[PDB]
């Protein structure tokens, strides 16, 4: 040891100066574990302590390398004794090896020497080297810097025990499982309960301790709680009230026809009726369905309201307002320029002192908005009057000229498409200190969901929220004391959604595989939970649940700052084990990983349970407190394996490591509250407990030592500890006599004195001894580790003398090698305390003499000169009191060590005795008496070593073994006072063992003696009583019982009847014990084959249950009665019956156990009434007996039995009612049953088919009266009609009867009609939520076209209903208003418009029409980018040629009308059509000709079929008469059609030729024709010089003329 006291200060001074010659501070730490050499020169790390950055420096010098390797191999040593740390508590790793036991402790001792130290610069890197390796991977890998300044701050401010010890002084119960010490960690966190030491020690070592505390069983209590309320309502999804967006050309449309619109503001309008949130269900506040809610402030009572606006109008002109019916001149547009109309504002929404009493709330749904909208020709609508219609007036009128949903310009329009443009909204959510429940909405559309946000202020209450399966972002800000609960009921089942509702369903495989947990951000699937506020809050849990089953939730328990989670369950505790396996594989699925599950469960009567489950193996443990009793139930995996029914202990604690279940607590034996011992336990089997810990209080312990010392030498093997749990009444902490207690190796036993306390663990040799032990006096500190042999070594304590006494040894001192005594420097003084005579062991004390000298040193004895005996041995002086006055022989034996080698040390030395003082060695050497100490046996060696022909055993730390041990897996005995080999007969205290003669070891089982039998079992204790060997049972009887036998050789007993105080033998002629069956006085026995004894009460011999008499053992036959329960057993064959089954005239019934049966049961006989005794004559229990032509009511179902007593099947009529008897299980049927298409009802309480009228709990059904069958379709009910549908359930409409469609009507609604009986209704309407019907003269409704006040309606001929907006008649589209009366014209539908021609009886046509905006080409389907059939499409800059009618169209794609010229030629379109003209046209006056063909007007000459006419080229008029063009002349008719003859112009009557008539003329050209006849048509006239017509009288070349002065023409 001085040895490293020089090494020390050896490297300690070179690392000194390595540190001055590199200018290194106090502040850089050598790294000894990283040293390279690399040619020659050493390089050595040194971590900067207060950054952690690394430096390296060279040196030469080699005694750094070199101790590093010293070191590093001693920490190693000891980082293979600890297991781990969980949170800084290290695990240790008990080793019982006595080569690990002896080499950890060197190594231990080493390195603790150094770290305790105040140089201390390579103390504390020596120190810190060891906790980086202790709690991390080692100083050498560790490179990060903040990680090693955390480390490095860590080993320097704490401290670690490292040398060997168990309790470490704690005083508590040890629990080594394993070989981990578990013990003082757990309870630590069941003391304290740190979140990181609890993860740790589930995550590390697999060890869940269950806790108890009020507290946590309270919480659980209201999550389970909540969890059952809010999972079980059967809410929408968001929008099923406001409407769904539909994605129409990649925006958003929320409505898209005027009464949808409308009507969305009439949902709006309930916000004025029922403020911001229905209360639906009585239990759960709901907001408006779209409701924009953007604050809800509970503290204040009050709500704010987000953004829900609508787009702008501006301009317009002629505003008038008649009827409430705007009307205009110039319409107004809207505008998405101008600020929007917040439509909330003319809603008078009371958004505060609010009611907020109920605890449940659904968060709203709605992301602000501003509404776009769209204006379209819809017509009809000028009658509308909804709250939606008074709504948007008052919008309207809140915002006057900005606003107007309905106008007329010069067609009436309206709103018509509501185009929602949404922003992203955060809902805060300001929560009070009481308790609130939430339930995020489901939202459909993506677009709106991720838009939405929730951002809760914690306060501390408790809150749940109920995730969606479509996540919402939410954010939580912790608050200090809340608590926070998420049911993931919807995550974590497959959803669906029917009929816009949400059910759950299946479990869905893995979805909690990954459960990210963060410090400030949960991930639960697809929903994730962000977290702000008090986010470092080490204490806090959050919890997850859900419901498993109808009566089992889950709660998994979520610690946000310790990253870490873990599983409970709670339910009633008999439900859940029943089900244990199979609500074990709904957590599997979910893909939870954690090995250990928690009970944890408050039932309605307020009694907790609390218990732990192995996942893997399914063993459960199950504590409680009945009526004061404790309970503990540990479950096999549904079937019950051990119960304590009272469990007599007080402090219980439970805990599970891996699926080993542990029970600690204080039990007081004899019931005294001053002898407290304390229990460690691992239930196993029914009968069989397993003790893995005892400590010892001071009272417990001395009586402990009490029965150690009187062992007898038993006081060694694992089994002198079930001798002491003996003779302390142990088994009282459970109650039953007979438990197998199980001490096995780790076992520890660790009593306390007033002095300190001692350590006992059992060996893999399945033996006990001394693990470690402390005590201290005044002024010395005894320590003994199993590590050093055993011995005391006494140490001086500070706070000068070393005193010793041999009581502390009392009853230890057998496990006792040597005590050594070790003063230091400052020891003048040895004080030894020999006088103590109550010991049975006095170990050889040692006076280690200081290495270093002192300057005096003085033994002192309190016992007399004349008692000693002085002896040299070596260099060693040797004192010895033998003390035989006595009847015990105390021999005290006395050793200085090698103060003969030191002639200076030799006389320093003064021993003082009681009656002389100041004596020196000198002196006692040359005048106390001397002796000669041979001791051949105090040797050095290892196993059985053999001196002086006797045999000796030397044990692990080559002592002396003494007493009964085990050794090799055989039983020894040495004896106590000489410690050979004993051979041959023993007795130890009572019971008497046996050693082979040969061996040495103890007899094990059967075997022969000198002549004898005799039996020993595998402990080697003599049995008294009958076993079985190689000739069979015989009986190893007490002494003096057959011609005095001494105790346990088989004995003579034959034919006769052996009664081992309460059990029966039989032995046979030979005196050896008979089994099987056999018959013995003419009377059956059944004898055990494994033990010899007779059965008694019902036992199963292969598979067949008999009955033996418990008195008399013998068989029983016949009838019997065994715990209240009635059995058959043959009165030949005693075989008891089972099943069907008849017994001299009778039938009976045996279930499975071969117990009576009583009821109703189908056989191959019939279905019998087996029955009570004393029912009918007087029967016996369970006989079929008669019951003719009866109802049986069996407490519980009903029965009819026909003549024959047998119960009736199926449809039966009794007595005037109808009854329906199960097929299988011949009982009455209840409620609806339908025997064949037919559908009955049996009242629940009679079992009699329903006849008549019946209300069943809703509706209202009728059942034939002779039947019993519910009604369908038109029925008749004495001369009244009524409908019903085809469940049966009375309707209440209109219906189709074989005379047209009837309403139905309800009560008193003429003339008190009965409700549901059709009625009269003559000339009127009935307009019946929706549908609209109109009923004609004998008041059946009419169906088909009809007109009723000039308003033309259609009504559906297969309902009798009214048709509204665009339908679809015999193929022709037709558009009804929302009243249901035709309308025609331009109408928008969709956002195209199309024409229904009034010409057309309103059918929807193709063509081109007059809209308000123009002449459009309503075209057929896919004309121009497959457009809709009539809808208005685009034709800009070209003509269009339709069904022989020809129009052009500008660059607004409407007709152009009236006077056109189109590139190059004149057009003329009816003002009235937009059609070309073609043809003959008089028009505006002037008369014009258009192409036939191509409808351009005619310019200049053309030849009209048959007639030639010239069209002015400047006004395209059809020129008449006299009209010159290019200069030429030319006469026209009054009808425009050129003429040829001789006709009158200015000049007068000039010719108008043919072609080439003169100077190659034109063809009706006026020509010069002078002086000469024409004579054309018959008529002749002759033309003067100026190529004129002459009239009057002339005289023509001598002939005279008469020209007619009106025409010109000869009439002579």
């Keep these: 040891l001085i040895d490293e006291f020089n090494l020390l200060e050896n490297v300690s001074d070179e690392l000194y100066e390595l540190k001055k010659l590199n200018n290194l501070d106090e502040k850089y730490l050598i790294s000894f574990e990283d040293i390279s050499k690399n040619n020659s020169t050493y390089s050595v790390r040194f971590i900067n302590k207060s950054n952690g950055e690394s430096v390296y420096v060279e040196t030469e010098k080699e005694i750094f390398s070199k101790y590093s390797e010293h070191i590093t191999k001693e920490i190693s040593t000891i980082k293979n004794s600890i297991i781990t740390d969980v949170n800084g508590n290290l695990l240790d790793n008990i080793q019982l090896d006595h080569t690990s036991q002896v080499n950890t402790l060197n190594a231990a001792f080493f390195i603790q020497s150094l770290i305790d130290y105040s140089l201390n610069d390579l103390s504390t890197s020596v120190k810190v080297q060891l906790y980086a390796q202790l709690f991390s991977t080692g100083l050498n890998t560790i490179y990060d810097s903040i990680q090693l300044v955390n480390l490095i701050s860590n080993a320097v401010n704490d401290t670690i025990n490292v040398l060997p010890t168990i309790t470490e002084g704690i005083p508590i119960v040890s629990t080594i499982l394993d070989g981990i010490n578990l013990g003082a960690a757990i309870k630590e966190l069941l003391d304290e309960h740190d979140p990181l030491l609890k993860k740790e020690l589930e995550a590390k070592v697999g060890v869940l301790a269950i806790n108890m505390s009020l507290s946590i069983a309270a919480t659980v209590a209201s999550i389970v709680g909540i969890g059952a309320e809010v999972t079980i309502f059967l809410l929408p999804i968001a929008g099923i009230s406001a409407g769904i967006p539909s994605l129409v050309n990649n925006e958003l449309i929320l409505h898209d026809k005027a009464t949808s619109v409308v009507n969305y503001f009439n949902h709006l309008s309930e916000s ?103 204006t379209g020709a819809v017509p009809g609508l000028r009658s509308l009057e909804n709250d939606g219609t008074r709504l948007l007036d008052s919008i309207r009128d809140l915002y006057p000229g900005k606003f107007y949903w309905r106008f007329y310009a010069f067609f009436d329009y309206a709103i018509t498409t509501l185009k929602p443009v949404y922003e992203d909204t955060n809902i805060k959510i300001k929560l009070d200190k009481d308790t609130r429940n939430f339930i995020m909405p489901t939202i459909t559309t993506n677009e709106i969901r991720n838009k939405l946000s929730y951002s809760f202020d914690g306060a501390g209450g408790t809150y749940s929220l109920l995730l969606s399966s479509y996540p919402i972002s939410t954010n939580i800000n912790l608050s200090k004391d809340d608590l926070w609960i998420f049911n993931i009921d919807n995550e974590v089942r497959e959803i669906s959604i029917e009929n816009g509702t949400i059910k759950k369903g299946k479990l869905i495989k893995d979805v909690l595989s990954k459960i990210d947990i963060n410090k400030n951000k949960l991930i639960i699937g697809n929903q994730t939970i962000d977290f702000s506020g008090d986010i470092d809050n080490k204490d806090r849990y959050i919890f997850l649940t859900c419901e498993l089953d109808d009566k089992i939730s889950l709660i998994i328990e979520i610690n946000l700052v310790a990253k870490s989670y873990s599983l409970l ?32 469960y408050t039932d309605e009567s307020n009694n907790k349970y609390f218990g732990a489950i192995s996942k893997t193996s399914q063993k459960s443990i199950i504590h409680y407190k009945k009526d004061s009793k404790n309970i503990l139930e540990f479950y096999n995996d549904s079937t019950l394996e051990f119960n304590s029914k009272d469990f007599i202990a007080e402090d219980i604690n439970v805990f599970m490591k891996d699926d080993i279940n542990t029970i600690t ?73 007979n438990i197998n207690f199980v001490i096995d190796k780790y076992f520890t036993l660790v009593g306390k004195t007033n002095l300190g306390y001692v350590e006992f663990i059992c060996d893999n040799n399945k033996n006990i001894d001394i693990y470690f032990g402390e005590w201290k006096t005044s002024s010395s500190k005894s320590t003994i580790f199993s590590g050093n042999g055993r011995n005391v070594v006494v140490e001086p304590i500070y706070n000068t003398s070393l005193d010793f006494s041999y009581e502390p040894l009392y009853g230890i001192d057998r496990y006792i090698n040597k005590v050594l005594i070790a003063p230091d420097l400052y020891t003048s003084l040895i004080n030894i305390n020999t006088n103590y005579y109550s010991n049975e062991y006095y170990p050889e004390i040692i006076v280690l003499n200081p290495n270093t000298f002192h300057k005096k040193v003085n033994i002192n004895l309190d016992s007399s000169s004349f008692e000693y005996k002085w002896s040299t041995e070596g260099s060693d002086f040797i004192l010895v009191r033998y003390l035989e006055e006595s009847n015990k022989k105390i021999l005290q034996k006395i050793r200085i060590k090698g103060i003969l080698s030191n002639t200076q040390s030799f006389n320093k030395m003064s021993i003082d005795f009681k009656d002389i003082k100041k004596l020196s060695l000198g002196y ?68 008497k063992y046996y050693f082979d003669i040969n061996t040495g070891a103890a007899l094990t089982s059967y075997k022969i003696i000198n002549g004898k039998h005799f039996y020993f079992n595998n402990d080697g204790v003599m049995q008294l009583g009958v076993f079985k060997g190689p000739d069979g049972f015989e009986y190893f009887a007490p002494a003096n019982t057959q011609n005095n036998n001494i105790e346990g050789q088989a004995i003579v007993y034959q034919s006769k009847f052996l009664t081992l105080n309460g059990k029966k033998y039989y032995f046979d002629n030979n005196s050896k014990a008979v089994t099987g069956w056999r018959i013995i006085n003419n009377e059956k026995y059944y004898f055990n084959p494994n033990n010899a004894i007779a059965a008694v009460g019902l036992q199963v011999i292969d598979n067949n249950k008999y009955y033996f008499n418990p008195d008399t053992a013998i068989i029983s036959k016949g009838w019997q009665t065994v715990n209240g329960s009635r059995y058959y057993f043959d009165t030949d064959t ?10 001299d005239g009778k039938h009976f019934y045996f279930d499975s156990d071969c117990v009576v049966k009583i009821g109703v049961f189908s056989t191959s006989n019939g279905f019998e009434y087996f029955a009570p005794a004393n029912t009918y004559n007087n029967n016996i229990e369970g006989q079929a007996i008669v019951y003719q032509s009866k109802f049986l009511t069996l407490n519980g179902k009903k029965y009819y039995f026909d003549n024959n007593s047998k119960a009736v099947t199926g449809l039966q009529t009794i007595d005037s009612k109808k009854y329906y008897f199960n097929t299988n299980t011949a009982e009455a049927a209840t409620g609806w049953q ?5 559908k009955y009802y049996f009242n629940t309480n009679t079992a009699e088919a329903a006849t008549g009228w019946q209300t069943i709990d809703g509706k209202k059904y009728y059942f034939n009266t002779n039947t019993a069958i519910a009604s369908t379709g038109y029925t008749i009910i004495n001369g009244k009609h009524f409908y019903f549908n085809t469940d049966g359930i009375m309707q209440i409409g209109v219906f189709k009867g074989p005379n047209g469609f009837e309403y139905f009507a309800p009560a008193n609604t003429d003339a008190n009609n009965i409700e549901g009986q059709a009625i009269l209704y003559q000339n009127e309407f009935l307009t019946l939520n929706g549908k609209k019907y109109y009923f004609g003269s004998d008041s059946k409704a009419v169906t088909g076209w009809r007109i009723i006040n000039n308003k033309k309606y259609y009504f559906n001929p297969n309902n009798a209903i009214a048709a509204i907006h665009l339908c679809t008649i015999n193929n022709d589209k037709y558009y009804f208003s929302y009243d249901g009366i035709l309308q025609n014209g331009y109408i928008t539908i969709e956002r195209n418009n199309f024409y229904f021609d009034a010409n057309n009886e309103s059918k929807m046509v193709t063509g081109v029409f007059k809209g308000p905006n123009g002449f459009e080409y309503f075209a057929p389907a896919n004309t121009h980018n497959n457009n809709i059939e009539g809808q208005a499409i685009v034709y800009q800059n070209k003509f269009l040629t339709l069904n022989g009618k020809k129009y052009y169209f500008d660059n607004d794609s409407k007709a152009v009308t009236g006077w056109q010229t189109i590139d190059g030629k004149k057009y003329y379109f009816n003002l009235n059509t937009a059609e070309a003209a073609t043809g003959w046209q008089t028009i505006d006056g002037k008369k014009y000709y258009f192409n036939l063909n191509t409808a351009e007007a005619a310019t200049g000459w053309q030849t009209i079929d048959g007639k030639k006419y010239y069209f002015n080229t400047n006004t395209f008029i059809a020129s008449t008469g006299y009209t010159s063009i290019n200069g030429k002349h030319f006469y026209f008719n009054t009808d425009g059609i050129m003429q040829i003859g001789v006709f009158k112009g200015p000049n007068g009557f000039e010719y108008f030729a043919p072609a080439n008539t003169d100077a190659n003329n034109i063809e009706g050209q006026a020509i010069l024709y002078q002086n000469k006849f024409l004579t054309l048509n018959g008529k002749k006239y002759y033309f003067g010089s100026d190529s004129k017509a002459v009239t009057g009288l002339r005289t023509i070349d001598g002939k005279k003329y008469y020209f007619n002065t009106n025409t010109a023409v000869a009439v002579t």
Excluded at 571 to 585: A, H
């Design 272 to 374: 004025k009726k029922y403020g911001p949130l229905k209360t639906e269900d009585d239990k759960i506040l709901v907001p408006i369905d779209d409701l924009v809610i953007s604050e809800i402030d509970f503290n204040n009572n009050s709500i704010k309201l987000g953004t829900c606006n609508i787009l702008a109008m501006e301009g317009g002109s002629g505003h008038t307002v008649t009827g409430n019916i705007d009307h205009f001149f110039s319409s107004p547009s809207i505008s998405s320029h101008i600020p929007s109309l917040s439509i909330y504002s003319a809603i008078g929404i009371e958004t505060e002192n609010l009611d907020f009493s109920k605890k449940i709330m659904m968060l709203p749904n709605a992301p602000s908005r501003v509404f776009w909208w769209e």
């Design 569 to 600: 369950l709670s339910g009633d505790k008999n439900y859940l084990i029943s089900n244990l396996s199979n609500t074990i594989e709904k957590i599997n699925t979910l893909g939870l990983d954690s090995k250990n599950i928690a009970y944890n």
């Design 665 to 737: 607590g204080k039990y007081y034996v004899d019931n005294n509250t001053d002898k407290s011992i304390d229990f460690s336990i691992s239930l196993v089997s029914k009968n069989q407990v397993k003790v893995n810990g005892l400590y010892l209080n001071e009272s417990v312990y001395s009586s402990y030592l009490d029965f150690v010392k009187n062992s007898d030498g038993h006081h060694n093997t694992s089994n002198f500890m079930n001798l002491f749990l003996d003779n302390i009444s142990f088994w009282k902490l459970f109650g039953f006599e």
């Design 924 to 991: 006692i050497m040359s005048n106390f008496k001397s002796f000669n100490s041979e001791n051949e046996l105090d040797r050095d060696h290892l196993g059985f070593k053999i001196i002086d022909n006797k045999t000796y055993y030397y044990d692990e730390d080559s002592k002396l073994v003494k007493g009964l041990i085990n050794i090799n897996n055989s039983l020894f005995y040495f004896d106590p006072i000489e410690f050979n080999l004993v051979t041959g007969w023993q007795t130890i205290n009572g019971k």
């Design 1134 to 1143: 005693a075989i008891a019956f089972n099943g069907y089954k008849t017994i």
């Design 1234 to 1238: 339908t025997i064949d298409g037919k």
